[PDB]
Swiss-Prot record, chains B, C:
<keyword id="KW-0963">Cytoplasm</keyword>
<dbReference type="InterPro" id="IPR018176">
    <property type="entry name" value="Tryptophanase_CS"/>
</dbReference>
<feature type="modified residue" description="N6-acetyllysine">
    <location>
        <position position="431"/>
    </location>
</feature>
<dbReference type="Pfam" id="PF01212">
    <property type="entry name" value="Beta_elim_lyase"/>
</dbReference>
<comment type="pathway">
    <text>Amino-acid degradation; L-tryptophan degradation via pyruvate pathway; indole and pyruvate from L-tryptophan: step 1/1.</text>
</comment>
<dbReference type="GO" id="GO:0042431">
    <property type="term" value="P:indole metabolic process"/>
</dbReference>
<dbReference type="GO" id="GO:0016829">
    <property type="term" value="F:lyase activity"/>
</dbReference>
<comment type="similarity">
    <text>Belongs to the beta-eliminating lyase family.</text>
</comment>
<dbReference type="GO" id="GO:0060187">
    <property type="term" value="C:cell pole"/>
</dbReference>
<dbReference type="InterPro" id="IPR013440">
    <property type="entry name" value="TNase"/>
</dbReference>
<dbReference type="GO" id="GO:0006569">
    <property type="term" value="P:L-tryptophan catabolic process"/>
</dbReference>
<dbReference type="GO" id="GO:0016020">
    <property type="term" value="C:membrane"/>
</dbReference>
<feature type="modified residue" description="N6-acetyllysine">
    <location>
        <position position="1"/>
    </location>
</feature>
<dbReference type="InterPro" id="IPR015421">
    <property type="entry name" value="PyrdxlP-dep_Trfase_major"/>
</dbReference>
<feature type="modified residue" description="N6-acetyllysine">
    <location>
        <position position="152"/>
    </location>
</feature>
<keyword id="KW-0456">Lyase</keyword>
<comment type="subunit">
    <text>Homotetramer.</text>
</comment>
Length: 433, 435, 435, 433
């Protein structure tokens, strides 16, 4: 069941209404790739939830108070300072997105090692619950074994892959939270701890990748026995003792439209922080009010009632769709991968099911989701933008997904009428087979 | 069936949780009276729909372009500018809210007649298909009393009549000679009408009344707080206009008054502001005098006590507030709540545009009007759910669920029906009160 | 010497240029009266300092955290919350602006005495070291007249006396028996005083008067629109307090009244809002009745017609408005304008906190009060410079340059002195008027 | 003379006041590199004017209307659409700063040529009024020959350097506006035209680099005979016919705190635009309200009265300082390079004059500017943040610069107490000699 929203709506952005008549000129002119579709034509946009969700009034006021100093920025203090209280790292380097924080730490952490341990470039390899090589447990992808912390570190797997390497050629460990395998599964503190030690020994750096830190917190609280009674920050603080440094995209749990963070725990890492400052000068990051905001989203992203709500309703949508037996090739907190061949068995791989599915939803409700499938299987993917849509929204979606599945029969398929050299799915244009 | 929100949500105000215990401490504290309950103790505050719901991005950006000149503010123009298009009136005085309009225009209109028609101070009576607290309080409190001329068919929770709050044209007709037209200083027309639980008025009905008014020639002040919900009802219900747009209907609608006085806190969806406007030169005279008064009361008529940004905003509210889809959603929802409530068997007045009314005593009947059956329901509701409702009373004193725009979802809706359920099945262990 | 602005500028409202020609069309149009000049025709609008100057980032962010509950809004608390700290009063009614406070509190205070002291309706008189338009208009317009008890030394543009707008303690003393203390319903204390051209009042002077008031025991309402500029003057001038902070002085200051009524449009630097407050339980009685009235006039005392965001903002205005540096700059500047004006030889009243006054007739003397020498200066100023000034008059009717906070720079300052120069040397080819 | 501001101030950010007492703990703890100084301690920050100036109320409202679509973003339309009306290019690709737009076009334009003309990588070279090689006229750096359009293209110089190369190894021409040599000098339309033709022939791409497009407009209007009577957009439109594509940092003339732009004129370049979309997917860019804003700053940046004002007062500051004979090693619209050895003759190169100068200003007024000098000469540099400070501000500065020049005698010098491996000036800490 869907929980009632633990807030009041104060500011809304209008969406017009669409006769299926109209919704077709549209998808036609889109040339059947909904990406290439005007929003403002999309009724319910499901294309992604990365900073496309709502904000709190404090977040808004925050944006009014930017001090746009280009140094010693009192705003920057605030941002880095809420980082110290929330995560207790003292080394905040605002980036402007997630992708930011990586483009900076990869090349440094590599070099730190290539030097004081003498790593070998062409035979180097990084590890991760989710080149990296992903060391996740066996339950991981077993939709239909209820394991509570599904994206944990395979401690042993990792152990092995380290010397299988061995220590001098692993620059770091990323520990994504929540883990990003299988539409987003939690990682336990006990596991987090565990894994961290497996690094202390071979002395490797541990980079906590936390776009969904708040959610992961909640799962630990909902589920790890011995925490059931810690608050979200309490959890989160403790959590962060098991990494040296954190790299996040604020556009998720932090609740802001723009923003990235790359930060460091203590001066045992000031050494590194020093070199990212050096690197960051040539590239990447942010408006002063941006910082004031993110400084707040950080605390706002963690309110319990909210996360409970947020996760509630992602859940609710999925329960909603199994109830009408729509196949999901995985379901979690990040996304929802409906399976399209199953929902649409009589349309081949080179006729494209996902696009086709995508367009129908579109015609029928005006939902915009996304062929993520091409070759393993053909998936069409859902995500939900925080504090943006309702249960009625969810209902409309679900229901729309019925009508699809009933006309599953005379819904057609697609064959290229233009396709660019790389990344076909972003601007290709299709027709049926 | 709840309609899905015709909009994405953009900015929310998060709200604290609660302990049943605490809540009790709270209501006990409130004078046993949810009304004086504090904002952060309530979880769904249905106290009133007046300036409490959401605004549009455009609305809010608008609030950053205030021109704050004390006199002849660009913003004042922008607002008059839109009053002309939306309603077609040419004389636009901004007041800070409806009470403003009203403390200004009654006494103005009361002197118009005391002279050119020699009206009798102590024998005077003003008419309306209803009057708000403010309207009659400010008319009782000025010397002149009102009498309502609603239809027989009015609050009858049995028959479902499409325009449930029209003017009784005849009961009005009568009332006019019955008091000597020299002495009706003005007729107020409320749209939608407040005390029907929010019931429509017909264009046709409007026409007809306007005729009687041009007849003894009496000012007609459209009271306009929910002008948009009214217009919608027409579009869905009055035969001729099924095909027009909302402004379109609005516009027609607004031919039948020499002036409008209005609270922008409801339909126009500003947190603050009201309008006092006149239609054409046949009234510039009045405008002139109103303008005079306004200084003294709200301040200079370039602001009538609005800041620049507020004018800017209302100037866009007035638009946004008419958007079709939106009111279809807004109304739907009030509606979906009422249906939700019939099915658990709670007798409530017809779906108006904005609130929902509840037969107090029936849901709990073994309570007599000595101990009050309206209030304890409030208290209870809150006690149990963290809902705040209140009882402004209307035969039978009863319970009102006014409903802030764009603020709560189907789910909040469902959570309220719910509490009425929990409440039903404890009517047995449930008491009465004297505050 | 202009002090440099103690702040970076963050958000500006760009302003249209002008053709001398057009400007003339414009003033001719205005009724020959700059006042009704339109906002975008003016280039430096000195019409009044009331809600027209700048706000702080904090102020403005604040406006995004409104809680908009009709009753018991978190924001209402935040605001009362800061009234307590800043002034130490415990009874905080928000009105939408000073007129509000005043339409509420006069009549309230007028019944206090009509009963417990049996005051005589028709024989009643209220006292003050001055009264604004609104204050006396709302007291003339309520039955009770005022008399001002300013000092001999008051408007004398010759002597420079540090606290130029004190109470004549004795001229007051006298006036009280002279009218029978049963009949003074209240004394209003203005700080700074408006009609001195903005002149300070002394803490000492305040004390002394408060004594006389506790004596015949009469309510003292501090009228508080420029309470901060007042406090500063003291800090720079009253001997004992040279060392304290502004709140510090404020606080002391505010012991000597049983209540304050206030317009936040000036010193507290909100675009909109006013306060009506009482100090301690010795008055909760009053508060109680004021609260009653407010409904009828501004609306429910959790907002007194303010939106949530406005409460939030003023709640931070009240602070920001006392910042030292700021008022040092604010005042400096008014000052630097006056000096600028003496040196081209224009006789103007002492530097008050906020405006600048001008001997009308002197700068142009071969104009007699038949043709008006105040107005044509206005017109001219504007005609020539795109300045708008106005003449609210004060012996001799004269010209006022009130000056919006944080809005115009030294340069704008210089550009105004300038026009007075251009204007001087054309007094020869310059005329008089009858509108 | 300083012109009065053609606006009203509405929103101010507070700055506290500082006893020189206090201003010293400060610069000390800064370790004598003012960069490392808390703003909020700086009275008048002169560190830079890149998006650290003010905005219009329309700019502010604009930021309230972001539609934060992750595609077909109605906001994006607005931004790209004001770009079409202002510059008439149809290919807007918002970046998130100036530096953005380059990191994208360099590598593409190189490749466009390396292929359809067959450029040679190690012997390739780009040209510019200001590797590139700068082809500016002889007057350029002659402080004290009043030439009105000082940063123009040396047509002949360029001519030569092209074949001296020849055409196949010049990927493009950048044409910075205003040109960035010698603290910012204009470029004439006639010159712009001229130069463009010198590319049409060898068919080279012309990339208009326009962080200060509005100012440059004004100079042309103030100065090119035959335009004296065109408006700023009129000028600007015409201007842009002489490039194929434009790369700007909105943080200057566009008047926003965040933002970049990379855009293209017509489909003769759609070809290229296509590949930058490809490249841009892996990296770089912006909040929806950001776009709404910049869409407005674009028009706002151009109001005449304003630019006149803005340039006025930059001028005024300089006239102000020659009047007290402070030596500027160059003066223009971008910055102001005071000469420090001249102002401070009795302090050597390895004792550092600029830092020393920087600190004194600081102690005396609380001005923060910047040693740009190390070896040619030792400069300390000023810039002014738009619509932020006043004339009184300027006066305070100027005057402060007197007191400096009178105690020119017992003002000391500096010698390293820590210096990092690269970019010493950003975090080094100094002491006197």
């Amino acid at each position: 069941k869907h929980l009632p929203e633990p807030f009041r709506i104060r500011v809304i952005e209008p969406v017009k209404r669409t006769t299926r008549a109209y919704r077709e000129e549209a998808i036609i002119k889109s040339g059947m790739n909904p990406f290439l579709l005007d929003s403002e034509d999309v009724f319910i946009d499901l294309l992604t939830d990365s900073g496309t969700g709502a904000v709190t009034q404090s977040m808004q006021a925050a944006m009014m108070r930017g001090d746009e100093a280009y140094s010693g920025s009192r705003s920057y203090y605030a941002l880095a300072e809420s980082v110290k209280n929330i995560f207790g790292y003292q080394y905040t380097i605002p980036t402007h997105q997630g992708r930011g924080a990586e483009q900076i730490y990869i090349p440094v952490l590599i070099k730190k090692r290539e030097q004081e341990k003498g790593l070998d470039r062409s035979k180097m390899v990084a590890f991760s619950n989710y080149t990296v090589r992903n060391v996740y447990i066996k339950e991981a992808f077993d939709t239909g074994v209820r394991y509570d912390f599904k994206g944990n570190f395979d401690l042993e797997g990792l152990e092995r892959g380290i010397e299988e390497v061995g220590p001098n050629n692993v620059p770091y460990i990323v520990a994504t939270i929540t883990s990003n395998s299988a539409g987003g599964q939690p990682v336990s503190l006990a596991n987090l701890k565990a894994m961290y030690s497996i690094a202390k020994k071979y002395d490797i750096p541990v980079v906590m990748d936390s776009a969904r830190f708040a959610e992961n917190a909640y799962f630990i609280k909902q589920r790890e026995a011995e925490y059931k009674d810690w608050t979200i920050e309490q959890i989160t603080r403790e959590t962060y003792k098991y990494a040296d440094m954190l790299a996040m995209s604020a556009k998720k749990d932090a609740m802001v439209p723009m923003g990235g963070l790359l930060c460091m725990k203590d001066d045992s890492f000031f050494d590194v922080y020093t070199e990212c400052r050096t690197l960051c000068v040539v590239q990447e990051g942010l408006e002063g009010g941006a910082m004031e905001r993110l400084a707040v989203g950080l605390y706002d992203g963690m309110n319990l009632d909210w996360l409970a709500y947020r996760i509630a309703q992602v859940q609710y949508l999925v329960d909603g769709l199994e109830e009408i037996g729509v196949v999901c090739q995985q379901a979690g907190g990040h996304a929802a991968f409906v399976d399209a061949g199953k929902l649409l068995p009589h349309i081949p791989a080179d006729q494209f099911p996902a696009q086709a599915l995508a367009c129908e939803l579109y015609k029928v409700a005006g939902i915009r989701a996304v062929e993520i499938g091409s070759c393993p299987a053909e998936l069409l993917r859902l995500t939900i933008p925080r504090a943006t849509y309702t249960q009625t929204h969810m209902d409309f979606i679900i229901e729309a997904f019925k009508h699809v599945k009933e006309n599953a029969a005379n819904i057609k398929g697609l064959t290229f009428t233009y396709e660019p050299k790389v990344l076909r799915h972003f601007t290709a244009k299709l027709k049926e087979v």
